[PDB]
Write a protein that binds this ligand. Sequence first.
Ligand SMILES: CCCCC/C=C\C/C=C\C/C=C\C/C=C\CCCC(=O)O
Length: 152
Amino acid sequence: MDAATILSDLSTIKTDINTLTQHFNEFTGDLLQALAAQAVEQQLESDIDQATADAKATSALSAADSTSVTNALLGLKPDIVTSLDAIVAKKPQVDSAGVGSLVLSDLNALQSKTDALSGALQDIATATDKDTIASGTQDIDAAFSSAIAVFS
Ligand SMILES: CCCCC/C=C\C/C=C\C/C=C\C/C=C\CCCC(=O)O
C-alpha cells in the first residue's frame, strides 16, 4: 500500500531466498529434506505474490522511494543467482530423490511470479529506475532460464 510496505515485503523475500539456499546446500536426496525446502519455497511464492499485490496498490513513487525499491529489487539478483546455483549443484541429489519435476514446477512458478513483481514495480518507479529494473530483471530471467534448462 506504500513504499515502506513494499520494502518490508522485499526484505521478507530476501530472507526466504537465503533460507532456501541453506536448505539446498544441506540436501542429501532425503525426501523429508525436500518437503522442508518445498514449504519454504511455497512461502517464497506467497511472499512474492504479496509484494506484487502491495505494489499494485501503490501510487507513483517519489524519487527517493523509487531508488529504495529499485535497489532492494536489484539487491535480490545476486541472492537469486546464488540460490539457483545451489539447487543446480544438487541436481544429482534431486535426480536420486526423483523430484526433478517439483524443482521444475517451482522454477517456472517463481519466474512467472518474479516477472509479475518486477512489472508491477516498474509501473510505479521513475522512468529512469524502470529501465534499471527492467535490465536487472533480464538478468534474473536469464538465471531462471539456465536453471530451468538444467532441470528439463
Ligand atoms: C525468487 C528466486 C528463486 C530462487 C531459487 C529458489 C528455488 C529454486 C526452486 C526450487 C527448489 C525448491 C524446492 C524443491 C524441492 C526439493 C528439491 C530439493 C530441495 C532441498 O534442498 O531439500
